[PDB]
Amino acid sequence: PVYIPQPRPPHPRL
Amino acid sequence: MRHLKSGRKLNRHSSHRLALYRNQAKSLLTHGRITTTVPKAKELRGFVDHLIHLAKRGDLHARRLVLRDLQDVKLVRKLFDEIAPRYRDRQGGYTRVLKLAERRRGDGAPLALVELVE
Amino acid sequence: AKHPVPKKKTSKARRDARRSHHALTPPTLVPCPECKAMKPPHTVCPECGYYAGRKVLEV
Amino acid sequence: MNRGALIKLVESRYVRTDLPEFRPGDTVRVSYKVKEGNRTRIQDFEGIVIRIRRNGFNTTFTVRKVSYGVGVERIFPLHSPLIQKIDIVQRGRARRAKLYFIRNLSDREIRRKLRADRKRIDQDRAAERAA
Amino acid sequence: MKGILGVKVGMTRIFRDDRAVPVTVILAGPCPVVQRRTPEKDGYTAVQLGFLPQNPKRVNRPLKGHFAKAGVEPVRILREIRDFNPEGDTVTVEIFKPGERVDVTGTSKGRGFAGVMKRWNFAGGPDSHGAHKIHRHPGSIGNRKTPGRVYKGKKMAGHYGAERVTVMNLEVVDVIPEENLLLVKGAVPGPNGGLVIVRETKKA
Amino acid sequence: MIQPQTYLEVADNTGARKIMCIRVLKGSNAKYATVGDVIVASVKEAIPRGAVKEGDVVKAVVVRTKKEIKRPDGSAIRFDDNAAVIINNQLEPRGTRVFGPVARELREKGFMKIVSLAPEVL
RNA sequence: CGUGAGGGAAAGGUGAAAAGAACCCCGGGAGGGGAGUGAAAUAGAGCCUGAAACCGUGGGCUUACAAGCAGUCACGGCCCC
RNA sequence: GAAUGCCGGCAUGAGUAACGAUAAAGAGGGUGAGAAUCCCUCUCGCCGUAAGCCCAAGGGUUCCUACGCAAUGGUCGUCAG
RNA sequence: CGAUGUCGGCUCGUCGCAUCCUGGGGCUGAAGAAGGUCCCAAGGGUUGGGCUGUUCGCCCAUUAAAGCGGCACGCGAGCUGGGUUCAGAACGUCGUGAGACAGUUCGGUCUCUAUCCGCCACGGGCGCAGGAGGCUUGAGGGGGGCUCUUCCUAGUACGAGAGGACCGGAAGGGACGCACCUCUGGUUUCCCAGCUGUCCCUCCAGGGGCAUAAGCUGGGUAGCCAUGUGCGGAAGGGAUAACCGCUGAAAGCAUCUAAGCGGGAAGCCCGCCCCAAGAUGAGGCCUCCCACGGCAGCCGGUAAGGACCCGGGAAGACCACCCGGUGGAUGGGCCGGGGGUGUAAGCGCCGCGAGGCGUUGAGCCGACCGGUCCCAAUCGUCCGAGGUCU
Ligand SMILES: [Mg+2]
Ligand SMILES: [Mg+2]
Ligand SMILES: [Mg+2]
Ligand SMILES: [Mg+2]
Ligand SMILES: [Mg+2]
Ligand SMILES: [Mg+2]
Ligand SMILES: [Mg+2]
Ligand SMILES: [Mg+2]
Ligand SMILES: [Mg+2]
Ligand SMILES: [Mg+2]
Ligand SMILES: [Mg+2]
Ligand SMILES: [Mg+2]
Ligand SMILES: [Mg+2]
Ligand SMILES: [Mg+2]
Ligand SMILES: [Mg+2]
Ligand SMILES: [Mg+2]
Ligand SMILES: [Mg+2]
Ligand SMILES: [Mg+2]
Ligand SMILES: [Mg+2]
Ligand SMILES: [Mg+2]
Ligand SMILES: [Mg+2]
Ligand SMILES: [Mg+2]
Ligand SMILES: [Mg+2]
Ligand SMILES: [Mg+2]
Ligand SMILES: [Mg+2]
Ligand SMILES: [Mg+2]
Ligand SMILES: [Mg+2]
Ligand SMILES: [Mg+2]
Ligand SMILES: [Mg+2]
Ligand SMILES: [Mg+2]
Ligand SMILES: [Mg+2]
Ligand SMILES: [Mg+2]
Ligand SMILES: [Mg+2]
Ligand SMILES: [Mg+2]
Ligand SMILES: [Mg+2]
Ligand SMILES: [Mg+2]
Ligand SMILES: [Mg+2]
Ligand SMILES: [Mg+2]
Ligand SMILES: [Mg+2]
Ligand SMILES: [Mg+2]
Ligand SMILES: [Mg+2]
Ligand SMILES: [Mg+2]
Ligand SMILES: [Mg+2]
Ligand SMILES: [Mg+2]
Ligand SMILES: [Mg+2]
Ligand SMILES: [Mg+2]
Ligand SMILES: [Mg+2]
Ligand SMILES: [Mg+2]
Ligand SMILES: [Mg+2]
Ligand SMILES: [Mg+2]
Ligand SMILES: [Mg+2]
Ligand SMILES: [Mg+2]
Ligand SMILES: [Mg+2]
Ligand SMILES: [Mg+2]
Ligand SMILES: [Mg+2]
Ligand SMILES: [Mg+2]
Ligand SMILES: [Mg+2]
Ligand SMILES: [Mg+2]
Ligand SMILES: [Mg+2]
Ligand SMILES: [Mg+2]
Ligand SMILES: [Mg+2]
Ligand SMILES: [Mg+2]
Ligand SMILES: [Mg+2]
Ligand SMILES: [Mg+2]
Ligand SMILES: [Mg+2]
Ligand SMILES: [Mg+2]
Ligand SMILES: [Mg+2]
Ligand SMILES: [Mg+2]
Ligand SMILES: [Mg+2]
Ligand SMILES: [Mg+2]
Ligand SMILES: [Mg+2]
Ligand SMILES: [Mg+2]
Ligand SMILES: [Mg+2]
Ligand SMILES: [Mg+2]
Ligand SMILES: [Mg+2]
Ligand SMILES: [Mg+2]
Ligand SMILES: [Mg+2]
Ligand SMILES: [Mg+2]
Ligand SMILES: [Mg+2]
Ligand SMILES: [Mg+2]
Ligand SMILES: [Mg+2]
Ligand SMILES: [Mg+2]
Ligand SMILES: [Mg+2]
Ligand SMILES: [Mg+2]
Ligand SMILES: [Mg+2]
Ligand SMILES: [Mg+2]
Ligand SMILES: [Mg+2]
Ligand SMILES: [Mg+2]
Ligand SMILES: [Mg+2]
Ligand SMILES: [Mg+2]
Ligand SMILES: [Mg+2]
Ligand SMILES: [Mg+2]
Ligand SMILES: [Mg+2]
Ligand SMILES: [Mg+2]
Ligand SMILES: [Mg+2]
Ligand SMILES: [Mg+2]
Ligand SMILES: [Mg+2]
Ligand SMILES: [Mg+2]
Ligand SMILES: [Mg+2]
Ligand SMILES: [Mg+2]
Ligand SMILES: [Mg+2]
Ligand SMILES: [Mg+2]
Ligand SMILES: [Mg+2]
Ligand SMILES: [Mg+2]
Ligand SMILES: [Mg+2]
Ligand SMILES: [Mg+2]
Ligand SMILES: [Mg+2]
Ligand SMILES: [Mg+2]
Ligand SMILES: [Mg+2]
Ligand SMILES: [Mg+2]
Ligand SMILES: [Mg+2]
Ligand SMILES: [Mg+2]
Ligand SMILES: [Mg+2]
Ligand SMILES: [Mg+2]
Ligand SMILES: [Mg+2]
Ligand SMILES: [Mg+2]
Ligand SMILES: [Mg+2]
Ligand SMILES: [Mg+2]
Ligand SMILES: [Mg+2]
Ligand SMILES: [Mg+2]
Ligand SMILES: [Mg+2]
Ligand SMILES: [Mg+2]
Ligand SMILES: [Mg+2]
Ligand SMILES: [Mg+2]
Ligand SMILES: [Mg+2]
Ligand SMILES: [Mg+2]
Ligand SMILES: [Mg+2]
Ligand SMILES: [Mg+2]
Ligand SMILES: [Mg+2]
Ligand SMILES: [Mg+2]
Ligand SMILES: [Mg+2]
Ligand SMILES: [Mg+2]
Ligand SMILES: [Mg+2]
Ligand SMILES: [Mg+2]
Ligand SMILES: [Mg+2]
Ligand SMILES: [Mg+2]
Ligand SMILES: [Mg+2]
Ligand SMILES: [Mg+2]
Ligand SMILES: [Mg+2]
Ligand SMILES: [Mg+2]
Ligand SMILES: [Mg+2]
Ligand SMILES: [Mg+2]
Ligand SMILES: [Mg+2]
Ligand SMILES: [Mg+2]
Ligand SMILES: [Mg+2]
Ligand SMILES: [Mg+2]
Ligand SMILES: [Mg+2]
Ligand SMILES: [Mg+2]
Ligand SMILES: [Mg+2]
Ligand SMILES: [Mg+2]
Ligand SMILES: [Mg+2]
Ligand SMILES: [Mg+2]
Ligand SMILES: [Mg+2]
Ligand SMILES: [Mg+2]
Ligand SMILES: [Mg+2]
Ligand SMILES: [Mg+2]
Ligand SMILES: [Mg+2]
Ligand SMILES: [Mg+2]
Ligand SMILES: [Mg+2]
Ligand SMILES: [Mg+2]
Ligand SMILES: [Mg+2]
Ligand SMILES: [Mg+2]
Ligand SMILES: [Mg+2]
Ligand SMILES: [Mg+2]
Ligand SMILES: [Mg+2]
Ligand SMILES: [Mg+2]
Ligand SMILES: [Mg+2]
Ligand SMILES: [Mg+2]
Ligand SMILES: [Mg+2]
Ligand SMILES: [Mg+2]
Ligand SMILES: [Mg+2]
Ligand SMILES: [Mg+2]
Ligand SMILES: [Mg+2]
Ligand SMILES: [Mg+2]
Ligand SMILES: [Mg+2]
Ligand SMILES: [Zn+2]
């Protein structure tokens, strides 16, 4: 494989 | 729930089912025997029975009624002149469905034949 | 949804146990009265074409 | 057994047989036995039969009338013992069986659509010529 | 404490004292006694009634021996009535008079696999305002790590109907003994053609 | 079948023409009012120089409804609108006459003042 | 693979010798069973050796009232030597 | 024996999701070892400022015919780019 | 910190009791009615709105009451995403500035597939020492449990008056629950009619496709339904809570207690409805088969029975369940009835004509109630006891 789909952002634990 | 409901859907919408029965009727009356799936056979039985009974009546109205489904004057003419007269004394049960032994290779469907009786 | 995933690999014991209910059942067969061939009940005989005692369709 | 027959048999002791036939569109007067503490009197109710739904003994018919400015509809069981009598007031010619549409009509427009049913008026008047 | 078997015929209404009366019509009689249950032999008391006669060409050998041991014709169904011991050998609708109050058991109509809303009248979800594929869903089923499980008996979807139901304190409106008919005011479980039990009421 | 937010025509000379039901005075949490039920409503529309004016929070009895009312004799009556008659805390009509027919149910509910004043009890 | 500059694999071995399996059988073929070759054919070309995970067939013991980091110690039953 | 290690192989999830527009099919006849799926006919439906026809770019034999069905075709295949 | 998603809402609840209501009490500065305060009680119940993202709170209209809390401030592999909590932009304020702010303002991507436990349902297997077809006992579970108004008692007891009961007895409600479809009211994908456009069959007339996965419009049976109908909460028995006692010492009196007995709650036990013998502690009763042939075991043919296969079903996802299989009405057709639509076509007459009238409540016509072997459930196959021991 060559291409990585970006991972989802996290839930903002702010 | 389906409680006390008559009539198969045959995974067709309302107008497709109708033409199925209509095209199956023209086929059966054109040839006298056809092979279909068992469910389609079991339902064509009453669709074709009624047309044949209207042909026993034999009036203009009946011909016009019958023509709504068969649309073919020559075939309707055969139904009224050759098919109906051999059922005059038969009170319904003009068709029959017999089940076949072998299934289709490509989808496993059970087949059966539908014919006009003697 | 949040994409449910298996938590452990299924053992050979658990996998096959789930297939406890997977055997084909053999087909129902009866001898045909006219030609004595074996065929499913309630079907026109595919070997001789007889059903209910009469030749129904040529084979 | 015959479940349909048994139902009829249970209903037969209550089935009425003395009322005039009428149709949606006919004007009609129902004399209805009504109670008011602690006596009972006869209150007429005149209007157009806008609907009749048939279920054997369980047929019921709806009559519509305006009344001191407000439209009032009433539903009667056709075999109710509370009905003293029914008088046929006017035979009306409808093209359909349920006349809900006259709820939104002016008086003059209802008259245009429900013109007098000549044929059944003559039927009435040609009856009542009897011994 | 009396009881009779029967069959739901269908509903209609009558007129009684210038009042409409919704009634179910039950064809109840006539039920032969086919076995009596004695405290000596069985430890309790009840009567095994039979109902609807049967073509013997369908009644098997061990069952024929049962009917014959009581000298009754083969019947289609057998049901007991607890603490009922009729003096005769045949129970009929003549055991119920108008004005009495009965309890009717029947097998309810079968909804099959029913949703949480049809079964338990759950509120469902919104149909707008961003609701996402949950309009008929049941919401939350639990808590979090405490208790970290779902209760036994938490209402969820599943089968619904085709089960034993009894309606209490039903008025008897009329009895027509010549046709074995029993007119009960109200509604009875199950479809027309279903088996029903009609017992005296346990209410006061 | 009257509930909060339902508008009723006003069947008397109180001066109010339209009221909007704001509570059904039939217990703790009744959902609907029918003929004979008292409601609390707001006057949304009234004629000039009335005994009542727009804004007043009044009590009313419902005298006729668009959902047909059923009756023990198996009959049923159904009007063209939802109408009400304005009353005082002692349930007497706050006007001096009533317009239109009214439901006979009002009689055995003790609204005999309205029943008499009405031109037709149906 | 990348527009391009550029990036950049995998893939060796029958047997001494093709003697590389005529011919027959089932089969549409593929594949197999015989026949034949060879010291050897689970050396038959998807070929030296042929481990492990993994999948199957057969057999011995065993299991449907039972609480489990799966073993360990004990005793008893059954099968083998 | 572990480096979310590197290469390879093989499991699990599982006979599960899916098989890519809800424009739609049915029958008879033929071919063939084999046919829902190929050919032929009748019926039915869909597009018709297109889902028809003609250029340009880009692609590069895909065109026609004969013989083929291991793989490619999301199933089948006697058909096919 | 190689991730434990954060407010409020919605949905679904469940528990606690320091009890908001309802039930039971003692004391009262308790006349009555109504309160106050404390005790017992967690069975059930605890409304609809305006404002704000709000929790909170205020307010409207009611109520028996409009209770406080735990469950990761319950619950985002259940939803929401208004607020918080990224990147844009603006205002006030701070900073020379870049920028900043528990200061404000407008906007701003929330992940189809459940492996294990758990939960709702439904089967398959084996077991329940002989094998079978029935009908049952109920160990143990589950469900339910709310409450108001008016009247009578009686304008009595009480009170100067206003006001106004206990106990006992009737009637009518709200919400909730289970079932039902007779009525009311929905739907009813082709059950009937009307209508436009277009293409077609066959020129007229009659019709068919398409305009949605019904072209549109007016209706609409069975089924499934609530807005509709029936019915439920109990009664009753028992044991108690706080509390009130009888007899009664220790302790010549007194004491509900130390011996002993009674009264006493919407609560506890039973009662009602439902599941229920895998209740392996595998229960009981009724009926049927039966000592089979060959070497507590094995292999054969059977018995009573069972399954397969088939026509079906208000039963159902598959499975299961239930009915039927020619000695038969199971489905399909036909016939009668119901029911819907609302007067077919053709012909005759009238009008120049669109039309109208008549034949005619005609024609068509799903499912409902029945009849009728006209068609199809043909013909068959396979399993299945020989009963261990004291
Ligand atoms: Mg990723
Ligand atoms: Mg559906
Ligand atoms: Mg049916
Ligand atoms: Mg499909
Ligand atoms: Mg269409
Ligand atoms: Mg028909
Ligand atoms: Mg057959
Ligand atoms: Mg078959
Ligand atoms: Mg094929
Ligand atoms: Mg989700
Ligand atoms: Mg999610
Ligand atoms: Mg999503
Ligand atoms: Mg899911
Ligand atoms: Mg997923
Ligand atoms: Mg697993
Ligand atoms: Mg494995
Ligand atoms: Mg294995
Ligand atoms: Mg293993
Ligand atoms: Mg498993
Ligand atoms: Mg599986
Ligand atoms: Mg298996
Ligand atoms: Mg029963
Ligand atoms: Mg429900
Ligand atoms: Mg619901
Ligand atoms: Mg909703
Ligand atoms: Mg969204
Ligand atoms: Mg979702
Ligand atoms: Mg949606
Ligand atoms: Mg749901
Ligand atoms: Mg959470
Ligand atoms: Mg836990
Ligand atoms: Mg069931
Ligand atoms: Mg104003
Ligand atoms: Mg104002
Ligand atoms: Mg008025
Ligand atoms: Mg490239
Ligand atoms: Mg290139
Ligand atoms: Mg390089
Ligand atoms: Mg070499
Ligand atoms: Mg070499
Ligand atoms: Mg060598
Ligand atoms: Mg050959
Ligand atoms: Mg070969
Ligand atoms: Mg071979
Ligand atoms: Mg070979
Ligand atoms: Mg050697
Ligand atoms: Mg070797
Ligand atoms: Mg070797
Ligand atoms: Mg070598
Ligand atoms: Mg090798
Ligand atoms: Mg190898
Ligand atoms: Mg093995
Ligand atoms: Mg145990
Ligand atoms: Mg064991
Ligand atoms: Mg352990
Ligand atoms: Mg030891
Ligand atoms: Mg190490
Ligand atoms: Mg490693
Ligand atoms: Mg990991
Ligand atoms: Mg790897
Ligand atoms: Mg795999
Ligand atoms: Mg599967
Ligand atoms: Mg899965
Ligand atoms: Mg699946
Ligand atoms: Mg998928
Ligand atoms: Mg699938
Ligand atoms: Mg796809
Ligand atoms: Mg795909
Ligand atoms: Mg597709
Ligand atoms: Mg279309
Ligand atoms: Mg056809
Ligand atoms: Mg073909
Ligand atoms: Mg093909
Ligand atoms: Mg093929
Ligand atoms: Mg296709
Ligand atoms: Mg072709
Ligand atoms: Mg055009
Ligand atoms: Mg266009
Ligand atoms: Mg290319
Ligand atoms: Mg070719
Ligand atoms: Mg190929
Ligand atoms: Mg091939
Ligand atoms: Mg090749
Ligand atoms: Mg392929
Ligand atoms: Mg593909
Ligand atoms: Mg292929
Ligand atoms: Mg192929
Ligand atoms: Mg070929
Ligand atoms: Mg080509
Ligand atoms: Mg952290
Ligand atoms: Mg990780
Ligand atoms: Mg982790
Ligand atoms: Mg993580
Ligand atoms: Mg995680
Ligand atoms: Mg809570
Ligand atoms: Mg306390
Ligand atoms: Mg209290
Ligand atoms: Mg008190
Ligand atoms: Mg007190
Ligand atoms: Mg006082
Ligand atoms: Mg007091
Ligand atoms: Mg409580
Ligand atoms: Mg609580
Ligand atoms: Mg509130
Ligand atoms: Mg507003
Ligand atoms: Mg607020
Ligand atoms: Mg605030
Ligand atoms: Mg109070
Ligand atoms: Mg939280
Ligand atoms: Mg909370
Ligand atoms: Mg949360
Ligand atoms: Mg989310
Ligand atoms: Mg949230
Ligand atoms: Mg969560
Ligand atoms: Mg999560
Ligand atoms: Mg936001
Ligand atoms: Mg938003
Ligand atoms: Mg960022
Ligand atoms: Mg500034
Ligand atoms: Mg500055
Ligand atoms: Mg800021
Ligand atoms: Mg602050
Ligand atoms: Mg601002
Ligand atoms: Mg915007
Ligand atoms: Mg914002
Ligand atoms: Mg989007
Ligand atoms: Mg994902
Ligand atoms: Mg799972
Ligand atoms: Mg687990
Ligand atoms: Mg089981
Ligand atoms: Mg037993
Ligand atoms: Mg118990
Ligand atoms: Mg247990
Ligand atoms: Mg008094
Ligand atoms: Mg005095
Ligand atoms: Mg009292
Ligand atoms: Mg209905
Ligand atoms: Mg009905
Ligand atoms: Mg209706
Ligand atoms: Mg209706
Ligand atoms: Mg209907
Ligand atoms: Mg039709
Ligand atoms: Mg024309
Ligand atoms: Mg047309
Ligand atoms: Mg066309
Ligand atoms: Mg078109
Ligand atoms: Mg159409
Ligand atoms: Mg309608
Ligand atoms: Mg319609
Ligand atoms: Mg009630
Ligand atoms: Mg004392
Ligand atoms: Mg004393
Ligand atoms: Mg004592
Ligand atoms: Mg006591
Ligand atoms: Mg006591
Ligand atoms: Mg109570
Ligand atoms: Mg039971
Ligand atoms: Mg049992
Ligand atoms: Mg136990
Ligand atoms: Mg047992
Ligand atoms: Mg079925
Ligand atoms: Mg059977
Ligand atoms: Mg048979
Ligand atoms: Mg039949
Ligand atoms: Mg029939
Ligand atoms: Mg008929
Ligand atoms: Mg009729
Ligand atoms: Mg009729
Ligand atoms: Mg006419
Ligand atoms: Mg005509
Ligand atoms: Mg004409
Ligand atoms: Mg002329
Ligand atoms: Mg008719
Ligand atoms: Mg007969
Ligand atoms: Mg045979
Ligand atoms: Zn044969």
| Dihedral over alpha carbons C12, C15, C18, C21 (to 10 degrees) | -70
Is E193's Cβ below 8 Å from some Cβ in D? Answer: yes
Asked if F75 and D76 touch (Cβ cutoff 8 Å), the reply is: yes
Asked if D47 and D28 touch (Cβ cutoff 8 Å), the reply is: yes
* Structural domain contains residue B87: yes
CB-CB neighbours of F39 under 10 Å: 25
Nearest to D45 by CA among C45, C53, F77, E137: F77
Nearest to E85 by CA among E142, E1, E177: E1
* Structural domain contains residue B7: no
| Alpha helix positions (H), chain E | 39-42, 61-70, 116-120
CA distance E199 to E101: 9
* Structural domain contains residue B99: yes
* Structural domain contains residue B19: yes
Q: Please state whether C53 falls in left (phi above 0), alpha (psi between -120 and 50) or beta.
A: left
HEC string of E130-145 equals CCCCCCCCCCCCCCEC
Query: Per DSSP, what are the bridge partners of residue D35?
Result: D40
C45 and B101 within 8 Å at the Cβ level: the answer is yes
Residue with tokens 């179910």: E24
Q: State the DSSP string of chain F.
A: -B-TT-EEEE-BSSSEEEEEEEEE-SSSS---B-TT-EEEEEEEEE-SS-SS-TT-EEEEEEEE-SSPEE-TTS-EEEESS-EEEEE-TTS-BSSS-B-SEE-THHHHTT-HHHHHHSSEE-
Residue with tokens 């046929």: D88
Strands (E), E20-176: 20-27, 31-37, 46-53, 75-82, 90-91, 101-107, 112-114, 158-160, 164-176
Tokens standing for residue D40 = 């009972």
Nearest to E12 among D7, D33, D80 (CB): D7
Q: State the DSSP string of D43-75.
A: EEEEEEEEEEE--GGG-EEEEEEEETTEEEEEE
**How far B10 CA sits from the closest chain E CA (Å)?**
22
Count CA atoms within 13 Å of residue E89 on its CB side. 6
Angle formed by the axes of helices B14-31 and B60-70, nearest 10°:
110
Which CATH number belongs to the domain containing residue B108 in this structure?
3.90.1030.10
Tokens standing for residue B2 = 């389906």
Instruction: Provide the residue range defining the domain that includes B33.
Output: 14-118
* Structural domain contains residue B8: no
Q: Please state whether F108 falls in left (phi above 0), alpha (psi between -120 and 50) or beta.
A: alpha
**Breaks in chain C after residues, C-to-N cutoff 2.5 Å:** none
Strand pairing report for D39-53 and F57-64: unpaired
Q: How far is the CA of E158 from the centre of ligand 64 (A)?
A: 17
CB-CB neighbours of E109 under 10 Å: 16
CA distance F5 to E162: 42
CB-CB neighbours of B51 under 10 Å: 26
Give the sheet arrangement for strand E46-53, strand by strand.
Answer: E75-82, E46-53, E31-37, E90-91
Element containing residue B65 per DSSP (H, E): helix B60-70
* Structural domain contains residue B106: yes
Domain count, chain B: 1
Asked if B75 and B59 touch (Cβ cutoff 8 Å), the reply is: no
DSSP, collapsed to helix, strand or coil, labels residue B41 as helix
Which residue in chain D is spatially nearest to E180 when comparing CA positions? D6
Single-letter residue type at E137: H
CA distance C59 to D57: 60
Asked if E76 and E5 touch (Cβ cutoff 8 Å), the reply is: no
Q: How far is the CA of E87 from the centre of ligand 7 (A)?
A: 53
* Structural domain contains residue B44: yes
DSSP, collapsed to helix, strand or coil, labels residue E8 as strand
Is E112's Cβ below 8 Å from some Cβ in B? Answer: yes
Resolution (Å) of this entry? 2.8
C51 and B98 within 8 Å at the Cβ level: the answer is yes
DSSP, collapsed to helix, strand or coil, labels residue E78 as strand
* Structural domain contains residue B79: yes
Is E151's Cβ below 8 Å from some Cβ in F? Answer: no
Tokens standing for residue C8 = 């452990």
- How far separated are the first and last CA of chain C, in Å rounded? 57
How many residues comprise chain F?
A: 122
Asked if D105 and D88 touch (Cβ cutoff 8 Å), the reply is: no
Tokens standing for residue B25 = 């009727």
C56 and B98 within 8 Å at the Cβ level: the answer is yes
CA distance E187 to E22: 8
Report phi then psi at B55, rounded to 5.
-70, -30
**Signed CA dihedral, F72, F75, F77, F78: sign only:** positive
* E166: Cβ contacts below 8 Å, ≥ 6 apart: E103, E104, E105, E189
Query: Per DSSP, what are the bridge partners of residue B97?
Result: B114
Asked if E26 and D1 touch (Cβ cutoff 8 Å), the reply is: no
CA distance F13 to D129: 53
